[PDB]
Amino acid sequence: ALDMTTLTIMRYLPREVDPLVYNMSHEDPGNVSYSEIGGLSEQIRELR
Amino acid sequence: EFLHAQEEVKRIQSIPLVIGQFLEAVDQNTAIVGSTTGSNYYVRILSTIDRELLKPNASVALHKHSNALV
Amino acid sequence: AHHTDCTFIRVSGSELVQKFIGEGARMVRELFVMAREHAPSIIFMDEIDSIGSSRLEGGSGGDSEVQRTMLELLNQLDGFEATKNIKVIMATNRIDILDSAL
Amino acid sequence: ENSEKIKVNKTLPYLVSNVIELLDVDPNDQEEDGANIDLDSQRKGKCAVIKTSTRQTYFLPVIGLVDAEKLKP
Amino acid sequence: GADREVQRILLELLNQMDGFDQNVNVKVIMATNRADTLDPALLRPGRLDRKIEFPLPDRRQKRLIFSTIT
Amino acid sequence: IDINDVTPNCRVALRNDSYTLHKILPNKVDPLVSLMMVEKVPDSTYEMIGG
Amino acid sequence: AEQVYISSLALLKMLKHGRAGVPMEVMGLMLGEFVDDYTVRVIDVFAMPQSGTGVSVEAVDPVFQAKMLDMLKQTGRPEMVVGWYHSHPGFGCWLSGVDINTQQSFEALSERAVAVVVDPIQSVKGKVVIDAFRLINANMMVLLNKPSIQALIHGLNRHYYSITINYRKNELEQKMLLNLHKKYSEHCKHNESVVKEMLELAKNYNKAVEEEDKMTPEQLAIKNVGKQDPKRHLEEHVDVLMTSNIVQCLAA
């Protein structure tokens, strides 16, 4: 953190990248069923 | 007295300082520098430092307000 | 060019044409005027055969076509002066890269 | 006393800005560089950011003048 | 689509090669995946000379690989 | 300095608050084409290669 | 005008505290004495509570100052407050609209008080950067045209008027300083120094010879052409080397 005219180090903090929720949109793992358009079942088993 | 004067000059500019990168030496105590703001100036430089052991790729600290190579 | 004591100007034909608007048409004509200030000069049309220092051996319709243009500029020049100092160098391997006009 | 203060900044020219990240822990981040020669872009932004339209990013700690939960990324 | 933005980048690589490699101590190695559209003077000697391309395997070479994994 | 003294395509110093030419620097060229390689000295001679 | 006299000890006290303060504002009170309105003596100063928000007109703490004065009084050094200091670190030496307001409160209390400002971040030049301020308060601010001026000074008050900063030396403090260097421990330190060099000489010799060998072909090559900044450097280098050997010699 720097100031805007003193131009000094106000703080130090460890470098991680910033988390993304503006690039991580959430779709919950159970707003559906795998017996809804199940019978696609077999391909599910191979991906599993 | 000579010594005393020599003390003053190193003080006149001190940190914070802005960075530029040296384009070329135009002549004695004149140089063309291109600042990393990306604004190029023709500038003064103080006699206290070698002027042909300075690399053409060397990044340099110049003052902000006066624009002279510290 | 060294013996002749002139500049060696290699112009690569395809580097004269631009997907930018109008810049290619301006480029072929623009070069001639430069040579005149530079005079005497050698214009080697580069990219129609090389040792292999620079890509491409051969090409018509844009190594010959830009070169053809040069022949026409020169035809007018030949009518409006009588001493030149601009030489054109073409290099080829192929005899089948040569147009009917050439 | 507070009411006059806020009002003055509203009269235009004024900066509207866009909050990219809601968050209110782990300050510090980075923008802009030095120079010389060879070109690869970089950009960052964290804690809460606003990016103002001169293309500048800013670190602010939250106020109750407007509520941050009511605000979004 | 463009050939300008990239141009200053390309000039600099040529400048650097020329700046050094008479007290060689740093190597330059290139990789490509679309080497159908290099520059002619990216190849002009005094900038690049060896071009190593990938080959088909020998029967004996396939075997070695197989011996290690098993 | 007067205008006869300048010759086109010179790098120059302009003041920033009076906007007059303090000095003139040396000269400068331009690549209008995307590859400029002019050789005024050669890479070959007679005995460059024989035969 | 006016002259404020700052103590020898005082300047150092001021600088330490402000530096710790960096880059936030620090204020304290100044103690000393008034003679006439011509002379201001600052014997001592004390700090009051710290603030990261900045000094304020209501940022004064009555208990603190009151309490400290008693304890100083007990030590046998009571005095009144002659005025106050506030810091500006690179926020310009020129006082803000806020500070004038602050400044007015004190002067309501006083009949006249001084503001001493230090820029501690511009104090790392290596010589003093201190400013002293007052308000525009006529009397001798009245001392383009001649009716215009006296009225202008009258009409308008509370403009920035810096004043002279001074000191007065004191012989005992002056002598103490000279002792703090020496070209108790020092007696040993000198003798030791002479010894240590002799042991090392074997190594020193080898480095000293190395420099000389590199340097010579160069000056010859340079002889031909014009001069450049390394030839000189190389010449200068050799001169110093030799001086150092004498000291090694001198030790026995």
From Swiss-Prot, chain A:
Entry superkingdom: Eukaryota
Record localization: Cytoplasm; Nucleus
Signal peptide range in chain numbering: none
Subunit structure and binding partners: Component of the 19S proteasome regulatory particle complex. The 26S proteasome consists of a 20S core particle (CP) and two 19S regulatory subunits (RP). The regulatory particle is made of a lid composed of 9 subunits, a base containing 6 ATPases including PSMC6 and few additional components. Interacts with PAAF1.
Protein purpose: Component of the 26S proteasome, a multiprotein complex involved in the ATP-dependent degradation of ubiquitinated proteins. This complex plays a key role in the maintenance of protein homeostasis by removing misfolded or damaged proteins, which could impair cellular functions, and by removing proteins whose functions are no longer required. Therefore, the proteasome participates in numerous cellular processes, including cell cycle progression, apoptosis, or DNA damage repair.
Similarity comment: family membership: Belongs to the AAA ATPase family.
UniProt-recorded name of the protein: 26S proteasome regulatory subunit 10B
Species classification: Eukaryota, Metazoa, Chordata, Craniata, Vertebrata
Name of the coding gene: PSMC6
Curated annotation (Swiss-Prot), chain E:
Record gene name: PSMC4
Organism whose genome encodes this protein: Homo sapiens
Subunit structure and binding partners: Component of the 19S proteasome regulatory particle complex. The 26S proteasome consists of a 20S core particle (CP) and two 19S regulatory subunits (RP). The regulatory particle is made of a lid composed of 9 subunits, a base containing 6 ATPases including PSMC4 and few additional components. Interacts with NR1I3. Interacts with PAAF1. Interacts with TRIM5. Interacts with ZFAND1.
Protein's job: Component of the 26S proteasome, a multiprotein complex involved in the ATP-dependent degradation of ubiquitinated proteins. This complex plays a key role in the maintenance of protein homeostasis by removing misfolded or damaged proteins, which could impair cellular functions, and by removing proteins whose functions are no longer required. Therefore, the proteasome participates in numerous cellular processes, including cell cycle progression, apoptosis, or DNA damage repair.
Name this polypeptide is given: 26S proteasome regulatory subunit 6B
Stretch of the intact protein here: 280 to 349 of 418
Superkingdom: Eukaryota
Location(s) in or outside the cell: Cytoplasm; Nucleus
Homology family: Belongs to the AAA ATPase family.
Curated annotation (Swiss-Prot), chain F:
Localisation: Cytoplasm; Nucleus
Superkingdom, natural source: Eukaryota
Modified residues (Phosphoserine): 18
Similarity-based family: Belongs to the AAA ATPase family.
Subunit comment: Component of the 19S proteasome regulatory particle complex. The 26S proteasome consists of a 20S core particle (CP) and two 19S regulatory subunits (RP). The regulatory particle is made of a lid composed of 9 subunits, a base containing 6 ATPases including PSMC5 and few additional components. Component of a complex with USP49 and RUVBL1. Interacts with PRPF19. Interacts with TRIM5. Interacts with NDC80. Interacts with PAAF1. Interacts, in vitro, with the thyroid hormone receptor (in a thyroid hormone T3-dependent manner) and with retinoid X receptor (RXR). Interacts with ERCC6.
Function according to Swiss-Prot or TrEMBL: Component of the 26S proteasome, a multiprotein complex involved in the ATP-dependent degradation of ubiquitinated proteins. This complex plays a key role in the maintenance of protein homeostasis by removing misfolded or damaged proteins, which could impair cellular functions, and by removing proteins whose functions are no longer required. Therefore, the proteasome participates in numerous cellular processes, including cell cycle progression, apoptosis, or DNA damage repair.
Protein name as it appears in the record: 26S proteasome regulatory subunit 8
Swiss-Prot record, chain G:
GO CC annotation: cytosol; cytosolic proteasome complex; extracellular region; ficolin-1-rich granule lumen; nucleoplasm; nucleus; proteasome accessory complex; proteasome complex
Tissue expression from the record: Widely expressed. Highest levels in heart and skeletal muscle.
Top-level taxonomic group: Eukaryota
Position of sequence motif JAMM motif: 86-99
Modified residue annotations for Phosphoserine: 123
EC number: 3.4.19.-
Enzyme class: hydrolase
Modified residues (Phosphothreonine): 216
UniProt keywords, alphabetically: DNA damage, DNA repair, Hydrolase, Metal-binding, Metalloprotease, Phosphoprotein, Protease, Proteasome, Ubl conjugation pathway, Zinc
SUPFAM superfamilies, per database record: JAB1/MPN domain (SSF102712)
The keyword Protein biosynthesis is annotated on this UniProt entry: no
Annotated ranges, domain MPN: 4-139
GO annotation terms (biological process): double-strand break repair via homologous recombination; double-strand break repair via nonhomologous end joining; proteasome-mediated ubiquitin-dependent protein catabolic process; protein deubiquitination; protein K63-linked deubiquitination; regulation of proteasomal protein catabolic process; response to ethanol; ubiquitin-dependent protein catabolic process
Pfam family, one: JAB
Binding positions for Zn(2+) per the UniProt entry: 86, 88, 99
Keyword Protein transport: no
PROSITE patterns: MPN
UniProt GO molecular function: endopeptidase activator activity; K63-linked deubiquitinase activity; metal ion binding; metal-dependent deubiquitinase activity; metallopeptidase activity; proteasome binding
Family the entry assigns: Belongs to the peptidase M67A family. PSMD14 subfamily.
Protein name as it appears in the record: 26S proteasome non-ATPase regulatory subunit 14
